[PDB]
Write a protein that binds this DNA or RNA. Structure first.
Ligand SMILES: *OP(=O)(O)OC[C@H]1O[C@@H](n2cnc3c(N)ncnc32)[C@H](O)[C@@H]1O
Ligand code: NA
Length: 634
DNA sequence: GCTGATGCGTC
DNA sequence: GTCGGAC
DNA sequence: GTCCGACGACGCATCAGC
């Protein structure tokens, strides 16, 4: 209706027609989306965020149904279905250059302000064409992603500058955040799905305008309304988990409604699905708690990458990553061995496996780092140098039957009976069915001796299905580095700090750490650190370290190719840091030359544990000790 | 034709 | 990937 | 328990600059 500047989607008793800031048939203004984002970031209760987004979506459904799909993508900061692999090719680098040119400022002034403010959007905002539309912005995002080849970056920057030129009010803030891949509203995929099912439930699509039914919940008690919306939410959520593709779902949702959705969109080979995830567990006793009276199995947790393998009726094979990226082209070796792993009675399947690097000469697992050296796309079978062994642990679909609602006890049995193991090519995950604490503890220890991270734990019959909408983190993961007093901890020196973002703007969000090389009496950067501290600890760090800020680095500190810290720090603080493994680093100088001529050592999954108030830098972990820790990984 | 910086996926 | 915090 | 924002190392693929 009126100026989108005053649009209030957090309004109590929000009316999808009377409270919209645009007219029926009008394109949804982008400022309407931005104002919704603003009202979402103002609150901390997710349910209030969902309500606010639901209000916007109800207006879109009632007034401008063609804009529902772009509005949803803008709210997710997605470009399209993940298996299509669309990429902006735009990060803070390209974006800050576009802002500098748009605002006519020096790139270094923009870069410094962005770091101080903790957000690129704030610089673009505080620094004539028609108003932007939601579908117009989304299409320009897609134009950026389709630009390739030489001189393509300059063309991307041209589009970004044109967007910023047309921005009003808060629009530039959220364009910049979206382009940088850091929307971070506090509302993401789960809340967007909750808002969508609520929106189409309360304001059914496909009504003749003006819609006779703008609030289908008004005739229900609060109790009945909540039960109804929860059921509708599960329909949408479970369908999406099986078909996480809005290009497919939304046209069906608009035409046939949410109740008929499962009839049109069903799990099928060749369409990636969401994978089942795992919740961390701190000890074997904790496991026995959450699985008190439910039989469960323990499996080795292999150190590779997830490979969801689809065999379609007719013989076509597709492979997808855990985030639904198409990996078919990177695994020609897997595609060729499918006839060898499945019995001839199998006509279609979806397998859940871990692809692990495998040394055929030595017949043993290789580290994850080796696996990542494989090529990623347009790979021909003859050129493969790092061989892969598949460790299969689940079966989601078989001979036309979805197993999503079947217990693991049955899925595992169909897996074990219809597929064939070959050493070093296709194996079932090593497993143990027991409830004895002593056998589990020995099994955990043996998993690490056999080159694995620890154990996966899964119920066999109680809440043991593959229904992600019911619970996405339905499995438990028990890694040895979760256990207190177990795993590698290091005492490292804080040599630099990185300015924080969003909530921590003006404070520190990360730090640069170093080990002490006795042979050269130098502090060598080993890794950055940005997790493990409580909010109180991170605030105290910002306080205690202010007295250490240096204008210039000490001459005995070496960081080589590490990211230069925003603030150098006088080497003094020593922190205890835990990691899962030590890796061979091309960038960090710590211990460079002690295990490899050109590469130093860094930490895998580093996290802060506590301050070592009783240690000075000269008693910190030495580069020689780092090298020793790396070697003992064998 | 090559190198290094950047982007974005893996874990 | 790990972690902490609001709900 | 759920969800989400904070942050980590690392590789290939790509393209700007040379
Ligand atoms: O730490 P995390 O949540 O990413 O762990 C889950 C991942 O672990 C991998 N994995 C390895 N071995 C298994 C088994 N046996 N079962 C399930 N997952 C397993 C997967 O890649 C998973 O995403
Ligand atoms: Na990243």
């Amino acid at each position: 209706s009126n100026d989108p500047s005053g649009y209030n989607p957090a309004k109590n008793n929000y009316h999808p027609v009377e409270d919209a800031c645009w007219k029926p048939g009008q394109k949804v203004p982008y400022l309407a989306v931005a104002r919704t984002f603003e009202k979402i970031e103002e609150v901390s209760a997710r349910l209030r965020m969902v309500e606010t987004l639901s209000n916007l979506l109800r207006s879109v459904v009632a007034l401008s149904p063609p804009d529902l799909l772009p509005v949803l993508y803008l709210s997710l900061n997605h470009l399209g279905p993940p298996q299509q692999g669309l990429e902006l090719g735009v990060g803070d680098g390209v974006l800050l250059k576009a802002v500098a040119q748009a605002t006519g400022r020096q790139l270094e002034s923009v870069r410094a302000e962005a770091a101080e403010k903790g957000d690129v959007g704030l610089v673009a905002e505080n620094s004539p064409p028609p108003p932007l539309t939601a579908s117009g912005v989304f299409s320009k995002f897609r134009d950026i992603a389709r630009l390739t080849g030489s001189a393509s970056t300059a063309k991307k920057i041209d589009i970004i500058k044109g967007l910023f030129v047309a921005c009003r009010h808060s629009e530039a803030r959220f364009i910049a955040r979206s382009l940088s891949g850091r929307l971070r509203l506090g509302l993401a995929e789960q809340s967007v799905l909750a808002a969508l099912s609520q929106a189409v439930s309360l304001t059914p699509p496909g009504q003749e305008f003006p819609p006779a039914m703008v609030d289908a919940g008004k005739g229900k008690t609060a109790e009945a309304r909540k039960t109804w919306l929860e059921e509708q939410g599960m329909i949408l959520k479970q369908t999406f988990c099986e078909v996480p593709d809005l290009d497919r779902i939304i046209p069906v949702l608009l035409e046939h409604g949410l109740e008929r959705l499962p009839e049109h969109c069903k799990l099928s080979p060749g369409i990636p699905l969401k994978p089942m995830l795992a919740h961390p567990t701190r000890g074997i006793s904790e496991v026995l708690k959450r699985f008190e009276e439910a039989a469960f199995t323990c499996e080795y947790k292999y150190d590779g990458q997830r490979a969801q393998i689809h065999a379609l009726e007719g013989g076509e094979v597709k492979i997808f990553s855990r985030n639904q990226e198409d990996n078919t082209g990177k695994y020609p070796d897997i595609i060729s061995r499918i006839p060898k792993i499945k019995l001839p009675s199998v006509t279609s399947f979806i397998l859940d496996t871990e692809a692990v690097a495998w040394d055929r000469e030595k017949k043993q697992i290789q580290p994850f780092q080796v696996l990542t050296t494989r090529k990623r796309k347009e790979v021909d079978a003859s050129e493969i140098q790092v061989q892969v062994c598949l460790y299969a642990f689940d079966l989601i679909y078989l001979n036309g039957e979805s197993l999503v609602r079947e217990p693991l006890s049955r899925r595992r049995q169909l897996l074990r009976e219809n597929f064939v193991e070959t050493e070093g090519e296709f194996v079932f995950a090593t497993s143990l069915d027991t409830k004895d604490i002593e056998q589990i503890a020995e099994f955990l220890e043996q998993s690490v001796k056999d080159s694995c991270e620890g154990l996966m734990v899964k119920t066999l019959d109680v809440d043991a299905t593959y229904e992600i909408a019911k619970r996405s983190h339905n499995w438990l993961k028990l890694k040895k580095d979760y256990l207190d007093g177990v795993g590698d901890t290091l005492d490292l020196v804080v040599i630099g700090a990185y300015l924080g973002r969003g909530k921590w703007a003006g404070r520190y969000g990360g730090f640069l750490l170093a080990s002490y090389d006795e042979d050269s009496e130098e502090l060598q950067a080993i890794c950055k650190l940005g997790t493990g501290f409580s909010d109180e600890e991170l605030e105290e760090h910002h306080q205690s370290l202010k007295a250490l800020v240096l204008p210039s680095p000490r001459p005995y500190v070496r960081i080589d190719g590490a990211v230069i810290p925003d603030h150098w720090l006088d080497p003094s603080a020593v922190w205890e840091v835990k990691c899962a493994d030590l890796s061979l680093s091309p960038i960090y100088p710590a211990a460079r030359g002690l295990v490899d001529s050109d590469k130093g050592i860094s930490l895998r999954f580093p996290r802060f544990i506590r301050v070592r108030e009783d240690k000075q830098p000269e008693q910190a972990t030495t580069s020689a000790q780092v090298a020793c820790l790396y070697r003992k990984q064998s």
